[PDB]
Enzyme design. Structure first.
Site: not given
Ligand SMILES: Nc1nc2c(ncn2[C@@H]2O[C@H](COP(=O)(O)OP(=O)(O)OP(=O)(O)O)[C@@H](O)[C@H]2O)c(=O)[nH]1
Ligand SMILES: Nc1nc2c(ncn2[C@@H]2O[C@H](COP(=O)(O)OP(=O)(O)OP(=O)(O)O)[C@@H](O)[C@H]2O)c(=O)[nH]1
Ligand SMILES: Nc1nc2c(ncn2[C@@H]2O[C@H](COP(=O)(O)OP(=O)(O)O)[C@@H](O)[C@H]2O)c(=O)[nH]1
Ligand SMILES: Nc1nc2c(ncn2[C@@H]2O[C@H](COP(=O)(O)OP(=O)(O)O)[C@@H](O)[C@H]2O)c(=O)[nH]1
Ligand SMILES: [Mg+2]
Ligand SMILES: [Mg+2]
Lengths: 428, 48, 34, 10, 60, 429, 48, 428, 425
Positions: H11, H60, H133-134, H168, H195, H217, H243
């Site tokens: 995600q 997902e 997890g992903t 989180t 973050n 983002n 480089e």
């Protein structure tokens, strides 16, 4: 992906009926099953709960389980009664009679084959089911015993799928069945070994909310089950809608269950405004985290302050920015260090779904694996042992075929579980 | 053109958030209509 | 075989015996100036 | 010719 | 409600024959190879059909 | 000039013919009356300007042929040349080869002869059928034998829909396939394997259609047929006739069962997003997931691949694709065939039928490849047949139609010989 | 000219899929309406 | 020519990819509908269409369906945008052993199709968060496959690590400590992108009352775009991926590199500051500019490399280097007295409509190795030790066919990282 | 490809009547006999079951057979009774009276010649006769006896034609005749030696379908005969209507008769949904395959679990994609390996017809040569043995040209059939 639901007993059946009303109203599904929704996001993930019909009708993936037919008649005569699939109404001629043994060994077993038939029929329809859900009450006869039999023999057939159990648990003040300790002790040891995640509901705290948090003069079960349906919707809101920080129920279980037997979370919701206070209080993330952690909101009658949180999770729904959902739930962590167990840093998980509920700027559902569940567990322990020593009400189970040793096994399981929670509370 | 096309309000999520917000009745609303119909029933009993 | 005919016509195209069967491919017969 | 005209019309 | 009467006569499931989906009885060949073919375009026709209206096409 | 006579046997052959003939009419501009000379190959020119297909539809069941007659293409097809019987073979090789097929083969051969008398440069015959049924296997076998004894050494392609490894319509399908294998070997110069599961998987993965059917698979088989036959009809860089790949594809008379792969076979959803270069489409062709036969090429070595290119393909791109396929180790060739490649190029891009799932592509590639891997389908087929015939299953029906008992044993011996030959030709020297 | 005809072909397939959507929309609407009047008449018949 | 394939995992990766690709489109001028300064990230189609050289990978479907419904649905190819059926649920074992294994083959299929489409592919840029997890499991498996298939091909990963205090998830330290083994051996360059510092920078230097994932983002998209601008557009001193990677990483096991970017200024503050090269370089060096919640003063810098965009002059850059050599707040290692790279490009950053950054004539992006980054690893291994002393959440990980020795071997791997960072930061 | 039909006995006549209503409804013919269909396909193969007259009237190619003329009066008075040829009604004076001997030897023989007159008429009138169809019940006297006599006489004259027969099998739960075992035993050996295919029906299963699946409160013989008539239409639908995968009676015989003595198939239909479930059911290949082999849709009162499917076949009707009817049906073969025999791969056969039954978008009728029919055969043979050991009800049979040894021969043949099913079971 999809979650398929079962409703055992009168309590579970009524609560699931309100749950399906809530879900249909959120997805714009009329009682006739047609779609009047106002957005494409409703159709994007409607397959999680619903199964489309030939005529465009959407039918719930719901199995209405009850050894008495009056509950089936009432749920069919309800406002959204014709929505359900007619053969999903499974019932017997003679009810459980508030008897765990009748619901689990003799009366429910003669129907549990058809229960399994309809469960496989609903499961094979789904492309890749996320899991099963069961709404029931631990104090009942067929909601508790037959529901636990359902969970037990669905665990064998689907080992790696999530098994949600929204179980309603009584309190001595609200005790409306003299056999509640027996049924609860006999159902908890099944839930421990057959449920990935169980959500505890207590009517005492629902009454407390309705009297104080909502200021409702005479709340009915149409209000209690409505409150429970709110968070049943909230837990899978992230499955059925997009979000900035998406979650699913398997991730909730993974991030909330540190040890396999500690999977008894406590019911909670926010916001809950009275009629007058609705236009007084400003709705924001700060006020949402105000109203979550207050003991008068989370609606199991076990005080959070009487123990420490193992883990917590907050599924926020609506328009909010992640900076606040992070900083509030870290500020509480820092400023209440004695109320979260220390060896598990970041006790609280956040998930953000950007789709608010009906007419609410934002909301949040709170899931808590707090130690204070041992309060109810041990209390049911002594209430069960007091009757078991004197062999009161045990003759019904004995004549229905349940042996003396199984009750001792249930006591052993309950006491070991209470000791486990106490150990992980007082561990340093 | 991205300025007009990429407006956050024009994104579908903002639209559905707005419509869900501006929908007339919340579920707390029917929670309160419960008390309303209890009062109506009490008044009917008094009249009878 | 064909239908209501009294009997089928003896087609010249082919026959069972590969001796009188009709084969498709019938192999058959300056002076320079100065 | 009429058939062609009708086919063109179609 | 002629379809209703027919459905009442039949014990099991019966859809309205007058509905266009069931009224269309083209085969797979007819549906996929001549999608817009009319009834008058087929080989056999009712004798009430006038020859002037019919397509005077007999080759490709 | 450079004609090609099509013979459509059985229900599967008739459906494949329907699809390929709408494709041919659309490609050559043949339209109903009232609505280049490359159409001489498949169509005969009446002095009136009319055009008649060079295909004999031949069925023992009135259903499919009479349904074509009742359809719109009745104007296109001659009232004759469209022969239909009254009783079908009913999944019985003996019934379709000895009792019912004997009374109609003479009429079929006479009509084939009258079709052939209109051609002066006939390249050969193209027999479309499935050996799963009775009339496709039995009557097809009889007609192939008669055409072999009448027309001599004329090229004879047979597009055969062999039973798939798992999906099978009938329970006697292995019997029919094994019985017809003898004729499909002796009297078929090139046999093209066209089983159903591979086409289904291909059109599911590439066309992104969840409901493929007989119409879709027949349109795809028609695309393959047109891609194979376009070289003579249309001018190109390297045109190939029937005999041109006959020689380049048949190394031994017993080894001619070949597999096909067609690409870019994509839908219009992905057509205008994907960049289908010549090298990319050739790689997709040689990928095992882009083939029409349910048989992994990795289980054998290619004996001789013949590529057909349609469109604006450049021979430099063709050679680059050949070089990269040869370098890649995921494609293995038999040791004694270093060349192993015969490719032809044509300037005519594929013609897309209206309403079809296939999308228009500026270029296309078709396979006709003899590979040792193909022995897997025969292994599955006779592994079905031996256990079927272990204790005389469905044998009385075949016996009662005038067939001796030993035919099944003879066919098993023939199939074992074919498998041994396929294993032997791939053996290293 | 090719790319233009791919544009045209995608426009026709766009209109075609829209036509298919409308066709099965009307088809399922006929489903629902016929079945609704069917249960209405079945209940009338049981009354009868 | 100059191709670099972007792979988004999970995600966080999908959101970072959306924010990056909108910026890349608005910089190259590549329209949202898909209509040679773009061949770095895009593939030309004969119809004039442009297909990005990306690949979305997640178990997902929420994020990928968000991409499929968003503004750039026409731009993005229907394939190359793959989705699974069930997420990793913040389980490294689940995403790397039992669910990632059934998607890794198809993911590598699309990787090799993209690679064959490319011809001058320097390498890969991977967007993911290792705490999930992903991003942990599929990141590990995909990087393993890429390293074993493509040899010494350059692989950069802009990875979002668990932050020092904000988090989180509860199993986030588990995922970080387990995926550090993959990021250490099978990743040429890894980029520290937690973050906390991004949120603090957004609230401090950008004046956004409600910072969110959209804003963070957007900032990370700006950082990535400034990183790849060297091979996108020409410049005074071009520094391609190969480089600058070799000048950035001094030792094969020491490549974990932090980032910062200046000037992040709102529109109101834009017209009040003389944003010179010296100004931006000091603002990007000071502890108020990094997107990584790490303090370079706590350690010593190993090797820095700056990349300026706009009207920046090499003489101004040299003056900036001279004036930063001497301030006591910043100190380098004794064995690297050069310690600086500085690339320059003439293309200024392109603000996005409805964005947050203000239009500036010049900007600088730092990416630097400093010994101080060992402290974030020390924090995360302390979290892991607190996590694992009681064997919390380990049953979930071992239930997916992953042995209990994986945690221990990862623990000594992180201990080795601590040891080697201290050793290379040591003096003579 | 004509199917000339005959209905014998009260039961046979009632199912024949309902079958003719179904066929006339499918082909668009009112009792007046004039075509009113809206599609060409109905007239395309109307000759399969109907015969044209001078004024365009379409008369069924049917022969009605019963010794008791009450059923002839009833069929004539029925809504579709003004459709059959008046001279095709062949009836006697004295009924069989549950006496197979009367139905086969004494009273049926004096009328079988008159019946074969009309039967030979119809067969000669057909352009190319595909086969004979017969409808009857093995428990009665006229049905069983006269149907078997007709089957034998038809076999002696038409060896190569398909002698399809439908026989309503008695059951103890629906026991309404005490000589049902006698008649069934006397008829089954004739059916074995003279019928290509014999589809067996049980009133018990027919009732249970309406009890559970169709949810009918009081289903009548009209409703049971409608179910079996829809099945009898679907078995021959492929002859009358085109499809993408054609079949016929010989097609099914070849695909469903592994051995000559095993041709007593088992009967089914789909979809079947209740008046209450009229709305919640979605017609698709997956749903059809889900209801395909269920016992709540299986219309024979024998457990399919206790037997092995020697062969199976499905006469799918409607417009459907072939990949599903192939793969979703091979799923049954893959996941029910123990149910089917391991020595015949892909025990299921499929055929596709493009014309669905009226009122249904999709449909399928099932034929199964399962080994569980040996259960019915054995449970009738047990009754026959128990009654015949005591020489019970034999005077009625033996006073009319019968002898004791023929009952023993029939019992031995029944037991041989049971053993034949058992050995491959
Ligand atoms: N590709 C394709 N194959 C078909 C089609 N129709 C039938 N088949 C094949 O034919 C096989 C079954 O053979 P049959 O149903 O007996 O058809 P037949 O071979 O012509 O024999 P008859 O039925 O006697 O006409 C199936 O396994 C299919 O693979 C079609 O339209 N397209
Ligand atoms: N920069 C940035 N980080 C994000 C964003 N969303 C999530 N994250 C990070 O992702 C981490 C957790 O991983 P997930 O968001 O669940 O991503 P994932 O693990 O690949 O997804 P799942 O495996 O399904 O849980 C958090 O610690 C966040 O810091 C985002 O929008 N921007
Ligand atoms: N929240 C809620 N609880 C209920 C409701 N109805 C019953 N209960 C609780 O459920 C318990 C009885 O369980 P019950 O469903 O009647 O068991 P059963 O009789 O075997 O089906 C009581 O202690 C009630 O407090 C309801 O509508 N809502
Ligand atoms: N399906 C069906 N079965 C019937 C009907 N009428 C009678 N039967 C069955 O047939 C058996 C009696 O056969 P019957 O027709 O009386 O033979 P007959 O008297 O010799 O003509 C009984 O056991 C009934 O169960 C009917 O209308 N439909
Ligand atoms: Mg046929
Ligand atoms: Mg995720």
């Amino acid at each position: 992906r999809e979650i398929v639901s079962c409703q055992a007993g009168q309590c579970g059946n009524q609560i699931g009926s309100k749950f399906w009303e809530v879900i249909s109203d959120e997805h714009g599904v009329d009682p006739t099953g047609t779609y009047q929704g106002d957005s494409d996001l409703q159709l994007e993930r409607i397959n999680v709960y619903f199964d489309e019909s030939s005529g465009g009708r959407y039918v719930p993936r719901a199995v209405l389980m009850d050894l008495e037919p009056g509950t089936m008649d009432s749920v069919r005569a309800g406002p959204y009664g014709q929505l359900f699939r007619p053969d999903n109404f499974i019932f017997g001629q003679s009810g459980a009679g508030n008897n765990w043994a009748k619901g689990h060994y003799t009366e429910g077993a003669e129907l549990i084959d058809s229960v399994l038939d309809v469960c496989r029929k609903e499961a094979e329809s789904c492309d890749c089911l996320q899991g099963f859900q069961l709404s029931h009450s631990l104090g009942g006869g067929t909601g508790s015993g037959m529901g636990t039999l359902l969970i037990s023999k669905l665990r064998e057939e689907y080992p790696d799928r999530i098994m949600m159990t929204f179980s309603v648990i009584p309190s001595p003040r609200v005790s409306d069945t003299v056999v509640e300790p027996y049924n609860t002790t006999l159902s908890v040891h099944q839930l421990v070994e057959n449920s990935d995640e169980s959500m505890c509901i207590d009517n005492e705290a629902l009454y407390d909310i309705c009297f104080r948090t909502l200021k409702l003069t005479t709340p009915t079960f149409g209000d209690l089950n409505h409150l429970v349906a709110a968070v049943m919707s909230g837990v899978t809101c992230c499955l059925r809608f997009p979000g900035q920080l998406n979650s699913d129920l398997r991730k909730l279980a993974v991030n909330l269950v540190p040890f396999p037997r500690l999977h008894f979370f406590m019911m909670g919701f926010a916001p809950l405004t009275s009629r007058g206070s609705q236009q007084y209080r400003g709705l924001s993330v700060a006020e949402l985290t105000q109203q979550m952690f207050d003991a008068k909101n989370m609606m199991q009658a076990a005080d959070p302050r009487h123990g420490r949180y193992l883990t917590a999770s907050a599924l926020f729904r609506g328009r909010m920015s992640t900076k606040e959902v992070d900083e509030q739930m870290l500020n509480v962590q820092n400023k209440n260090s004695s109320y979260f167990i220390e060896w598990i840093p970041n006790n609280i998980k956040s998930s953000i779904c950007d789709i608010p509920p009906k007419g609410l700027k934002m909301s949040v559902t709170f899931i808590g694996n707090n130690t204070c569940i041992q309060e109810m567990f041990r209390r049911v322990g002594e209430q069960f042992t007091g009757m078991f020593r004197r062999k009161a009400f045990l003759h019904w189970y004995t004549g229905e075929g349940m042996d003396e040793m199984e009750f001792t096994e249930a006591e052993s399981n309950m006491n070991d579980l209470v000791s486990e929670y106490q150990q992980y509370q007082d561990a340093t | 053109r991205y300025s007009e096309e990429g407006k956050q309000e024009n994104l579908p999520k903002y639209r559905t958030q707005d419509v869900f917000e501006q929908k007339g009745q919340s579920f707390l609303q029917k929670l309160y209509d419960s008390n309303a119909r209890q009062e109506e029933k009490n008044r009917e009993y008094r009249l009878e | 075989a064909y239908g209501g005919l009294f009997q089928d016509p003896p087609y010249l195209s082919s026959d069972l015996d590969p001796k009188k069967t009709d084969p498709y491919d019938k192999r058959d017969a300056r002076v320079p100036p100065g | 010719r009429e058939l062609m005209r009708l086919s063109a019309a179609k | 409600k002629a379809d209703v009467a027919i459905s009442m006569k039949i014990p099991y499931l019966t859809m309205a024959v007058s509905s266009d989906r069931l009224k269309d009885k083209a085969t797979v060949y007819r549906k996929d190879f001549m999608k817009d073919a009319t009834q008058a375009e087929y080989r056999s026709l009712t004798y009430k059909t006038n020859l002037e209206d019919l397509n005077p096409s007999y080759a490709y | 000039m450079r004609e090609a006579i099509c013979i459509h046997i059985g229900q599967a052959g008739c459906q494949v013919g329907n699809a390929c003939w709408e494709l041919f009419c659309l490609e050559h501009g043949i339209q109903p009356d009232g609505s280049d000379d490359a159409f001489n190959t498949f169509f005969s020119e009446t002095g009136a300007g009319k055009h008649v297909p060079r295909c004999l539809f031949l069925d023992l069941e009135p259903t499919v042929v009479d349904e074509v007659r009742t359809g719109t293409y009745r104007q296109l097809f001659n009232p004759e040349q469209l022969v239909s019987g009254k009783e079908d073979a009913a999944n019985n090789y003996a019934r379709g080869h000895y009792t019912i097929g004997k009374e109609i083969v003479d009429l079929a051969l006479d009509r084939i002869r009258k079709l052939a008398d209109n051609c002066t440069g006939l390249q050969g015959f193209m027999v479309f059928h499935a050996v799963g049924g009775g009339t496709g296997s039995g009557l097809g076998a009889l007609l192939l034998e008669r055409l072999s004894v009448d027309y001599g050494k004329k090229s004879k392609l047979g597009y055969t829909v062999y039973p798939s490894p798992q999906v099978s319509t009938a329970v006697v399908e292995p019997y029919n396939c094994v019985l017809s294998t003898h004729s499909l070997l002796e009297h078929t110069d090139v046999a093209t394997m066209l089983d159903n599961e591979a086409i289904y998987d291909l059109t599911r993965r590439s066309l992104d259609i969840e409901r493929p059917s007989y119409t879709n698979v027949n349109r795809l088989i028609g695309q393959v047929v047109s891609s194979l036959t376009a070289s003579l009809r249309f001018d190109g860089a390297l045109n190939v006739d029937l005999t041109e790949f006959q020689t380049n594809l048949v190394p031994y008379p017993r080894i001619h069962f070949v597999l096909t792969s067609y690409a870019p076979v994509v839908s219009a959803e992905k057509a205008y997003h994907e960049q289908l270069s010549v090298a990319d489409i050739t790689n997709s062709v040689f990928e095992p997931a882009g083939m029409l036969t349910k048989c992994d090429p990795r289980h054998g070595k290619y004996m001789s691949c013949c590529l057909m290119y349609r469109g604006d393909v450049v021979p430099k791109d063709v050679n680059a694709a050949i070089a990269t396929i040869k370098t890649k180790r995921t494609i293995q060739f038999v040791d004694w065939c270093p060349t192993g490649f015969k490719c032809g190029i044509n300037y005519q891009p594929p013609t897309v039928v209206p309403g079809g799932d296939l999308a228009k592509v500026q270029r296309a590639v078709c396979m006709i490849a003899n590979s040792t891997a193909i022995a897997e389908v025969f292994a599955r087929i006779d592994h079905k047949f031996d256990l079927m015939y272990s204790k005389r299953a469905f044998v009385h029906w075949y016996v009662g139609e005038g067939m001796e008992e030993g035919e099944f044993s003879e066919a098993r011996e023939d199939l074992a010989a074919l498998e041994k030959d396929y294993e032997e030709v791939g053996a290293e020297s | 000219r090719n790319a233009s005809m791919i544009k045209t072909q995608l426009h026709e397939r766009y209109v075609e899929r829209v036509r298919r959507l409308e066709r099965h929309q009307q088809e399922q609407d006929a489903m629902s309406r016929h079945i609704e009047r069917l249960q209405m008449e079945e209940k009338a018949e049981k009354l009868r």
